[PDB]
Amino acid sequence: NSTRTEWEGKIAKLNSVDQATKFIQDFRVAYSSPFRKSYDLDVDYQYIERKIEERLSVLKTEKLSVADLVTKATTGEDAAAVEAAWIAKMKAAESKYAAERIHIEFRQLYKPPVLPVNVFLRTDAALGTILMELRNTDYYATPLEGLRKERGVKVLHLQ
Amino acid sequence: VNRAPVGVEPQEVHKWLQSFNWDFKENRTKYATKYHMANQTKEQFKVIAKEYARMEAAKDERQFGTLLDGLTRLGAGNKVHPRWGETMKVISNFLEVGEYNAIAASAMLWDSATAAEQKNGYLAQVLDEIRHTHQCAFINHYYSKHYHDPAGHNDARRTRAIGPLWKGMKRVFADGFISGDAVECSVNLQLVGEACFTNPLIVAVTEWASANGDEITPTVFLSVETDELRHMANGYQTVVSIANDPAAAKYLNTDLNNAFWTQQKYFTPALGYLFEYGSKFKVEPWVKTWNRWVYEDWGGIWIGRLGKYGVESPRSLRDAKTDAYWAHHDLALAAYALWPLGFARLALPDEEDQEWFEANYPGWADHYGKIYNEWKKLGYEDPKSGFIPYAWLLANGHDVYIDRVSQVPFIPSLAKGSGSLRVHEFNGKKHSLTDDWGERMWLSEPERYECHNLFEQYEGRELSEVIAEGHGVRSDGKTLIAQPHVRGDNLWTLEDIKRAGCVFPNPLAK
Amino acid sequence: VNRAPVGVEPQEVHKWLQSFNWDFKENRTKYATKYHMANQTKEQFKVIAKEYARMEAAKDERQFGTLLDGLTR
Amino acid sequence: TKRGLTDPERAAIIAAAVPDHALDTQRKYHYFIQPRWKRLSEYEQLSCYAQPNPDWIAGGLDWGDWTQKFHGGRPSWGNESTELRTTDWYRHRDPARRWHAPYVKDKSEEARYTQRFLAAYSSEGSIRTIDAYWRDEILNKYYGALLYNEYGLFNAHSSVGRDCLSDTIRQSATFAGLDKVDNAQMIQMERLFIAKLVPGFDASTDVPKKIWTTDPIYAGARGAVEEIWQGIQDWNEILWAGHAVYDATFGQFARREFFQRLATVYGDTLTPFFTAQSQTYFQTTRGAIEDLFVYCLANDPEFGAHNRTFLNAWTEHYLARSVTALKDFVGIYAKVEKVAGATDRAGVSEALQRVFGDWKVDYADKIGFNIDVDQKVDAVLAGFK
Amino acid sequence: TKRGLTDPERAAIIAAAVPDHALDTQRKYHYFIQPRWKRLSEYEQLSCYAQPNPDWIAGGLDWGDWTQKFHGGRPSWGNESTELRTTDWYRHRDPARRWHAPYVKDKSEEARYTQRFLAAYSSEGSIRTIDAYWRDEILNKYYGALLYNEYGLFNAHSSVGRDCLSDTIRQSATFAGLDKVDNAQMIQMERLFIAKLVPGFDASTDVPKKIWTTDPIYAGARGAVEEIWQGIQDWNEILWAGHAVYDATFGQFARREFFQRLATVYGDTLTPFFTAQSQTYFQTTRGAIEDLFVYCLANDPEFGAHNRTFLNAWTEHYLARSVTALKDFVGIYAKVEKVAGATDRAGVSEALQRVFGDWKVDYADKIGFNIDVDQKVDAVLAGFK
Ligand SMILES: [Fe+3]
Ligand SMILES: [Fe+3]
């Protein structure tokens, strides 16, 4: 595969922690979620993401200190503050669509090696708990046509 | 001092197991969930580690002596009819992955529990699922040594990733057990996966195998079956533990219905197809077996037993009953049309099989037998003809689609079951859905269902290159593991597939 | 001290089996016979009680599993 | 009713259908697995590549994405569950080559021998020579209190059993957890046996639980166990902090150097029987843990300095928490009868030197950690009465 | 080449030949054997009446005389091989119900656990805490010298294996002899293990053999063993004098009360592991010997006073020879470091009281023998330094 090789060639040029943080955040925002901007890397982006994650981990262990590796985010801000802020932001979401947008954006922005593993897993569990409790209420109340309208999907064929 | 011979039995040690836990502030579960488990839930079997090991060793010695000494002396390895010999390649390898993922499912249930006895039961279940995985591996290990075609038994773990039937298997028995709420995975694995489908299947596989001349599979599976009652007990205790939670009355029936639909959507077609189309001697029609398994045993007895805790029968049972008559024939047509992508040898139904099919399914002839006879006349089994069934289907206006959620193939113009085709466009990508429940699942949680089908992965690629890159060839490097006949002569090679010149299209290109 | 994992195999115990006998006057056979057995006769298999039991149990489990499970089925 | 081996008609039909020659010449099961030893073993054949992993998890053979995921998008298995990195998660081999059948075979043999020994010991009346103070106070209270240490180290494996990224590592972790719970149950079995032998002996867990949760001597132990149980989520960190640092120092001291050694100076013939089982389990688990964390992760060809950095940080933190636990525990020597060379300051100093030197040679030299044994000994002995 | 199960033609012929109904309704194997317990067991079915004995040997079912005999007319088996009489030689039942398969199963489990324990103990370095004087002198010399006592008691069973008049008694005697030889081999295994652990330790049998054959401490032991080995021919007398009198006093003292007890006051963690196996074997043999000599012979309905007379005479003689052996052996307490309550005169007095009282209750009350424990204790302690 040539796409993998040329993206790896671009990845190998990162030499700073800030550069690797910007790169990984941009890549995840562009190509990851169902709300991704482009679908042009559908079958190759999960390999390139793992390459970027390996380069940023190597850079982190070569540049930062133990206190930074354990307590701080790669953006330079305190991990506990990030967790508290994002749980406060989820708790204020009114509907299930805003809640899922918040969860998806948190996974796209603060995901290891960018945020420490333990804090990220603890925050992900809390966000998922809120999301599941909010989604599963009245699962069968809305008809399929209303669901199609609410999701904003375009119908191309209906046998 | 008293000088009488005494010991300590397991029930005396088990009496004190509850008091091994102590309360501190952060003694909570690590995973996201909607329910809380009751602290005073007890266990129905009085098992500790040493007693468990003693029982399992007693079972294993009896199981292994037979296979390694008696059936080998009898030469029973090469006295099985070929069709069942190729059916077992798929069956054993597909049961192995489900047994393996049950390990992680039970480990997550043990993580979620709060009582010590409930943790002990879940630990015993973890050990049992490790044992079941190793037994399922050993079946293929024996067929690799003593059967006359070891090509499919050799490397199933590597070569199963080429075909379309493997993705629906991963959804129902790999990702449906470990991804989601812990209670959702519990009801997927025990209340529906083992109580409703797996346990009846391990008994039916043995009778079909013994009817077709096989005695290894009965030997392994009859011993495997002896452990499940403890897992059913685990499932009942999990349902009893969440009954007093307020959430239960809010979510339990929704999760039960979703799990039931997820499991049935794949086990209704696949088991029936493998039984009826992969055997020479027919024990029973699949429709009656399905009726007595799901509709009357699980649907009635277990559901009535748990009804006192608020559980209700699923609201999608009518659709399952409606489509449980022709689904496996549609799946059989799909599996015959895409034989080069599998890892087993197939065989079209002959005259006696056609008579049985018409006797037990009136109307089978005019629809399916005509297609099979036409394929046979056009050179289905002849390497020199260069006949690809998929090209024939495409040239005749019959198209194949794959469901986004369930990952099951679908041919709208040659299907007599339920479901219709739905094509949607979201965020610049096109998706195809085949039923109402899967459509609701995809419209409610679009982030959980992002799987790739083989049409997207293989689009625009020649078939022989796809086969060669996935290690689908035999030892000599040219013959393919999959064949359209079960004879020992006139096998297909890579050049025969290359001559046909099949190229994968985009079904949704419109 | 040396902290490497070791055990004792049967051939090491069997090496010393000859020296377990001691000579006293009435160390003779109790039965009527015409021959005398040589004092320095050796054995061709290096068997002690625990090794014998291990081998016999390994044989018996294989023998009994077949009859009690497969041929009965 | 009718079988294909014994029915003449079906046997004849099958014999007609079966080809007279083999269709393939390769009869080895999963021949493509790379063998660690000279030849491929049954353990590797039945174990390796059982977990279906896509190519974006190192060493996987599948392709694509998971069919179903968590709410919000968490994968079924992902690279986000651990800090350590490797080129292949399928490299781990158990030195003992244990799959289910040999494992249950060994444990069953141990369980049947234990019952026979207890019956003979009860018939023989050997309990009469035990020291009354030792049996009444020290054993009955503090040996029973060690049960909860074992139980917590057992419960630490719940997340490892679910989040692990391989299939041999899963077996190793499950077997280690079953060993810990078996140790706890064996301690309770010994207490119950002594309760049926000696009148007036209480085998209830109320006093040991009160000691575990309230007594100062174990105050430093609980803490450590708690943070290893419900304080961290990384499965590699749990394994390392539980088996390679905390247990190998504190549990090794408490099991080997206090209870087994002092039983043999107070005339106790029952405790070493169970302590031997505990030590055998410990050594078997140590082999696998050392293999995983030294051969595969710390000596990775591409990574390895990254893994060594994380391992050194973890070792520093949890060695501090084990030294705290040991310095807290060493205050139990004021409750025993004085014995020269064992209970006085010199005996404890040599015991601590032995434990710390063994741990040094076993783990610290292989990981790259620098330790001063004399400083650790003095730090622990600062709590000696 | 061709089998009757898988050949269609032969299977059809056999199916034609086999009758469609059963010709008899009794399916129990050897139903005419009288059960000792509630129902007939597999041990009894596979064991009893295997020896073909004519009607002039009590309990036999055959008739006539032996087809071939010794020169001069000695029968193959006769009533002239023992002094004791009974109405049925087929009455003996082993309490443990041991035939070949469970017996080898248990011993195999013990052999595999022993190897695992030795590997773990070697890895763990527990030998460093043993007392140097105890290990160097007492263990290495006198524990090795006990080997020949075990070997002689083993060789005493050769004539019992040939002259016995039953088939369950033959199994019991053979298993007892195999237990004795296993004890001797286990002592040598422990010596060899300690030789690979400690440098300078000698595991050769030269010094223990010189102690056994020359040292005064064992002078009274050899004698007794010799008369039990090559001094008598009656198989009942050999069994009684070897297992119920001499072993149960002298061997019980030497094994349980000196070596196992003093190991636990000198910090030895290796000896009790083997001593436990020895004691389990002793208890298992004691059950069968007690059953044979109390339930069947001494409590015979017709005889029994005759058997009690002979048993009392034998007990008198061999109790005198065991008291001589013990009084001779008790001089080893001058070679050990003094420990209060164990090594002084009071500890030995209580140890002897325990042994003699246990033997009294176990055998003498059931046979009818009158014993004064205080007199025996004083007679033995007359040899205390
Ligand atoms: Fe299972
Ligand atoms: Fe199960």
Automatic annotation (TrEMBL), chain A:
Top-level taxonomic group: Bacteria
Keywords: Monooxygenase, Oxidoreductase
Signal sequence range: none
Gene3D superfamilies in the record: Methane monooxygenase, gamma chain, domain 1, Methane monooxygenase, gamma chain, domain 2
Pfam families, A to Z: MeMO_Hyd_G (PF02964)
GO terms, biological process: methane metabolic process
GO molecular function: methane monooxygenase [NAD(P)H] activity
NCBIfam families membership: MethMoxGammaMmoZ
Name recorded for this polypeptide: Methane monooxygenase
Native organism: Methylosinus sporium
TrEMBL record, chain B:
Transmembrane annotation, as ranges: none
Residues annotated for Fe(3+) 1 binding in this entry: E99, E129, H132, E194, E228
Record flagged with keyword Nucleus: no
InterPro entries: Ferritin-like_SF, Phenol_Hydrox, RNR-like
Pfam families for the chain: Phenol_Hydrox (PF02332)
Superkingdom per UniProt: Bacteria
Keywords: Metal-binding, Monooxygenase, Oxidoreductase
Binding site for Fe(3+) 2: E99, E129, E194
Binding site for Fe(3+) 3: E129, E194, E228, H231
GO MF entries: metal ion binding; monooxygenase activity
Keyword Ubl conjugation in record: no
Protein name: Methane monooxygenase
The organism of origin for this protein: Methylosinus sporium
From TrEMBL, chains D, E:
GO molecular function, a single term: oxidoreductase activity, acting on paired donors, with incorporation or reduction of molecular oxygen, NAD(P)H as one donor, and incorporation of one atom of oxygen
Keywords: Monooxygenase, Oxidoreductase
Alphabetical list of Gene3D superfamilies matching this protein: Ribonucleotide Reductase, subunit A (1.10.620.20)
SUPFAM superfamilies in the record: Ferritin-like
Matching InterPro entries: Ferritin-like_SF, MethMoxA_beta, MP_mOase_hydro, Phenol_Hydrox, RNR-like
Superkingdom of origin: Bacteria
Record-linked Pfam families: Phenol_Hydrox (PF02332)
Record protein name field: Methane monooxygenase
Organism this protein belongs to: Methylosinus sporium
